[PDB]
Amino acid sequence: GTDSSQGIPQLVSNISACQVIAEAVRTTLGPRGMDKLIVDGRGKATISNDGATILKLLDVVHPAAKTLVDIAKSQDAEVGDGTTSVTLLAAEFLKQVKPYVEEGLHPQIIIRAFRTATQLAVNKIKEIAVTVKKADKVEQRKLLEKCAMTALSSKLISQQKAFFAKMVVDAVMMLDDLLQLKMIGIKKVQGGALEDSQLVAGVAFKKTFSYAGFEMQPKKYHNPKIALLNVELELKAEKDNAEIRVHTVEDYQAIVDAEWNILYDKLEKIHHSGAKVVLSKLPIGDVATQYFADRDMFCAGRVPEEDLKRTMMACGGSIQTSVNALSADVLGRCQVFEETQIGGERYNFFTGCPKAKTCTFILRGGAEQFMEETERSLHDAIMIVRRAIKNDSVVAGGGAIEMELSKYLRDYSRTIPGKQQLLIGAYAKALEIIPRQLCDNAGFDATNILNKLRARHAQGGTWYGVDINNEDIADNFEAFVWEPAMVRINALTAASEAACLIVSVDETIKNPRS
Amino acid sequence: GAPEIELALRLTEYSRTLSGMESYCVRAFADAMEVIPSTLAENAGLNPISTVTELRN
């Protein structure tokens, strides 16, 4: 059959469906903003502080939960940041109208009035917004280090940001023109030391395959012609399943030495392809490497396709369908190849990539379980440092403007009302809950702090805000806690309609039933 | 409750000073104190746990 339901029981279940989900991301998103180990499968155990990922990871059992994903995810693609908060804001009204829904009181303007309310902010957000680029230095790459410093400091290490923030700038520069994780793609290291990284702006290979000698096999090329190969060469190569009869007589040595030779061709067609540094996602074989270490052209097998791709994007090269490399652009090429061990692991580093738009990072952490949190600082900073690049207009981070707006808005709760001072008051307050959560998921107080900001928001000051580490009143942009205006702009507009959408929905039809 | 908040803090490290199986005793003995004005602090509102961390210091 078909299922359907209408009205308050559905409509409250409509808002009941949503409010369950926004608590997944609730205390998340920050340095003291919590982190989610979410295990949605038996051997599948997943960890994210971002909603969109776990939104992708978690099951959505509701149109609400369905309608929510993109809304938060809408802020994901933008900055790389802010799904969790958009999730918070979407259902944040839903508790405020539960008075109304249990009043049964709902003219639909409630969502329609929050819209101009959403307008007065995203407008005001960009008004107070200020370009950091042309304002800061004449340089605008120490500005990025400022952003890098501030944006390396909001999750994990502020220890290494003094060292890292300058490199975050350097990564973004080579990142910018193609905005990619692979080209900031980090190679973790450990055991050579604890807790450090360094930018390497050419590409790097975590993997390679060499035996039949290694220290006797050339590990470096001061002019690598880089074969980016997906090819495989195994113990013996075979074009036939079988013909005649392991033993017999003439048939025994007949197969074996040729099974050797069918390798030699691919073993050759690699080496006369101008593959000296040789890179094959599928492994080079042992007797192949017996050959490869005999031919003294450095091979690699068990090679990452990303490593193959980081190169092809850094060299303008290409992954190759043929062991023969005719084109140096179908080939990869550099003016430096090395197998050098940073931490002791065999690595194939390419500097001299003509494009070299892939910055690699060689990063050490404190322990096994301490390392993740470190580079997300590196990854976040770039995203928001780039975000500081993309929209130069930038306000105080850390929800500085909301309290002002919360005031500024329910200021209309004095100005607006024949009615909707409620709506304007209820609209005004839901802003504050995101950092108040950040305040509260810090275990610390907000109505204390945020109102003190508000007391100076009563001064008219807006960028007044909280530094989530210290968790006390401040001016975030003077602390230079940063987000561009458009960051604040979308999260509202993202969650605003979400708060508006299903409130037009008192009814959901299910044909499949349930 | 400051007299505790001074002394409990004191006796702890002085309990620590004792060593012996018993050095743990006077700490928790001392430790018992400063929770008293804590409630009293919360009886006045705010956050003793924050405060009593600090008033201790």
Add this chain to the structure above:
Amino acid sequence: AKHFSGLEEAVYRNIQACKELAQTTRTAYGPNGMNKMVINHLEKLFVTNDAATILRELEVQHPAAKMIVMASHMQEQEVGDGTNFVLVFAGALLELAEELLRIGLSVSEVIEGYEIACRKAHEILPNLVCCSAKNLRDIDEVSSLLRTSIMSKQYGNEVFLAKLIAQACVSIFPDSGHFNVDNIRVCKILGSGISSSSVLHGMVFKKETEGDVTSVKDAKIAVYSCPFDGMITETKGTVLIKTAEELMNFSKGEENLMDAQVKAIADTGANVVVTGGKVADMALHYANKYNIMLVRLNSKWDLRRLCKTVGATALPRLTPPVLEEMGHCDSVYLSEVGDTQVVVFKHEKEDGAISTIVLRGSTDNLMDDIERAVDDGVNTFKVLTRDKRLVPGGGATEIELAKQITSYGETCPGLEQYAIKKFAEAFEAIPRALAENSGVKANEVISKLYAVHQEGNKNVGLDIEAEVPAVKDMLEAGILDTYLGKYWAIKLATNAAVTVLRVDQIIMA
């Protein structure tokens, strides 16, 4: 269906129909609706304020609702709005008589009270007809004319759609004066904005379009569901997987196979070879080398779309098209349609009768909402071709009849007296279906509408001016109904409810 009994269907199943039918109008009908989530056996969120859709999107668990559901659909057929009407109005009809039962008034008796009144309605109906407007070449007159219907069925942009929707139907037949049930086949394309939605004509394949344009001017096609994957009945397409050598060899023969393929179509002539089937590599690059246009992965819809406009038949077999099997269009060309690159054919002087409005947005619901709206605009266009008659928007029109219908009931008496005055009540639910969709009370409105007392410009629409119920002039508002649609609306709702009023409960073997 129902072994159930005990005087149920009348006192009971009928209102449950109204239950199912209400709120699918009363908060879904007006200047806008208020969204109704739907998940079909195809599981996705479907927001429908359109009566016809959400009805069919639900599956009837009644014999009761089963009847009048079509009375709302046939309206979308006959009109393109007043479908939510049949939900509320016919839903507002019989629940009245629910009293008459406990009032002790019979079925066959009180039907007459409802029966005669539709005439009296149909007799009052020409009165409140307010002016009229027709130019089938007006986008503007039709924009405001398509407004009232899209409004009820659209919460999305009323005016810019009215600019787009009154464009195509006016634009696809520039002449008009002859209009097709389907004169516009919108090419729904996700991406950009709902404003990026634009008005094109002829045929569009949003499907994969390949080869190359060798004539943008000439559009000749043999529409096919035949795969160029190696499906042809000229030779025998035979794929040999038994040995890798066999696979490599037929691909070589595939070049000359596709040489027996897209050649043979453009042998009859062709530009696009419309492919509802599949095209393999040696065939694709051949047709790319043969430089015929291959639109690929064409589904049955774009076929069924294009099959009608050219007059050619999609063939699952590959043969050189006969005159019947080779279609021609005005022009076939690659244009971003709403700024997304897909092939767009041209049929206008072709005889046209297909406009492609790219329906857009960053979600289907944006592309689906206007999809609910645009057809009402496509619909009222023919409703315009039928009568030029303008009768104002809903909620102003009903009060004038009702007052007369009530005084008519006063002149009615005999035990159907109030059974007529019941019919007089079925009116006020429509502005209430706006007022409820707005969130204020019609009693106030009814008080006002009989306070202001005049009848047919006085109505409250879905508004933020509806905080306090606030009347607007429907004829003047740019909300423009017609005589027919209302005359259609009253008809089926008066038709379907009085006959489901005549039902008994079902005995079963």
Add this chain to the structure above:
Amino acid sequence: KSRLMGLEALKSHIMAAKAVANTMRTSLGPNGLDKMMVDKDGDVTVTNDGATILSMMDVDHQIAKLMVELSKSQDDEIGDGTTGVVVLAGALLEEAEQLLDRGIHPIRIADGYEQAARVAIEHLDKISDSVLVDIKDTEPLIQTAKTTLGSKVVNSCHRQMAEIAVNAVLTVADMERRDVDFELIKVEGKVGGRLEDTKLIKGVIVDKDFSHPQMPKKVEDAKIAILTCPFEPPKPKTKHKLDVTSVEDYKALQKYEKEKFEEMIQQIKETGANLAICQWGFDDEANHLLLQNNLPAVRWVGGPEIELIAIATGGRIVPRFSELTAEKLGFAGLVQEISFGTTKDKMLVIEQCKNSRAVTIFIRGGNKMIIEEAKRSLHDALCVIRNLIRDNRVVYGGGAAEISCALAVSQEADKCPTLEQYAMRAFADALEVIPMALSENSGMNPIQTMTEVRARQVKEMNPALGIDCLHKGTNDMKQQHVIETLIGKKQQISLATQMVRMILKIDDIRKPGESEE
């Protein structure tokens, strides 16, 4: 599945990570109590080794997996400390409980433990930071290779296990490079030997011996013929594999491979390498010829091993019987099968006094777990030794540093006005499990036993003297030669606190229940 957060997900995290520590703290130290652990496979494993326990442990509660991880990290580099970081976790874990029970916020608690761990690892630096060369280190190495091999159950009567390690990391990796090669050190072991049987081999011992000892059992320096070529069926990848049942083809085949293998073996004698190592090795028919050729040569060889025969010997690679040239000759100092006095133990040492790129530390013993006992002995011994042979930085163990660390942390906790003033001091509290369980492992009342060390550290303020780690009656650490790499405690601490800290940072659990895998 369900969302679990806060105290809920807290007591989720609390169970096993606390519960698992218990068997391991009862296993803590040599006095740590063994655990018979029996599979559903019918297996039986008696383990006081938490690293082996965690390996043996398949138990649920993903955190209980994350310790199986975390021990292995410290297992390779630091060696010992695999178990303690685990039992220290549950310590500061339950320690974390009552601060939340106090109302100290989940991110308030972790960081108080965390920075207080900085002071700890910082205070750790005050014990002994020394650095010496291998030949000096061996004395602090063997004094620790007392503990390591001994906490691994019988260092006893071995500097053979102790001082080949002094060579092991030494030869494969430099002192200063500090690049971890236990991968280059070949830790090899054989049942049927003796714990009193332990050997350093700077080259590779290949178990396969000469086809016949009637053929020379000593091949001269190098002249190893690197051969990937069948002298038995080379599991050749191309054809359907069938032996013949008829006497006709029985005779036709037997004359065939007598011709080639001989002229192969003569071609080997022609390549000038009087040992033929064959990656596809010798059946008997080729060996009669080989014997008839009077060519010393090697039978079946593991595929990568003849490559490992190349690198570890610096051996130049002759790939295949098709590539044959007399120029490339594999390296062997002396090719001979080695019976150690254990004759059932016969390997052919390729013994490199010239190019040794894989150092085989070869230990023996009566039985499987015995050598395994001796392997993880020889493993972590060297692993602790590797620290000390690189930087010989020694803390004296058994809770002597704990109080020492717990002392400074405690007051400095109070010195920090931050809420973690409790947590940092709560941090210094759970350090005391280290002498505690050890006390009860050693069979002593910890609460007194530990404050002995406190009274010691109140006076000493350094691990030197301590309690019994070995239950010997002399309550000592330095003098009891309880000697622990000062790197490792810094390792061990940082491992515990930060793993837990993310366990503390992760309060948000989507699982069907409290715990999961």
Add this chain to the structure above:
Amino acid sequence: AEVARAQAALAVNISAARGLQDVLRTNLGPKGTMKMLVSGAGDIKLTKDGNVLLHEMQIQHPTAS
């Protein structure tokens, strides 16, 4: 097997006779209505014809014969 005797053998007969007969009085004459019998087809049959609804779907009775 089961035998129905006397007035018991009479009852369900006249009971299933008159009652089902009484079910049908919405009809018979223009003042009668239509009567809805949905057959197994799901068909909506609103009918004032007595001949119709008998055979289509009728609650099981020996009297239905």
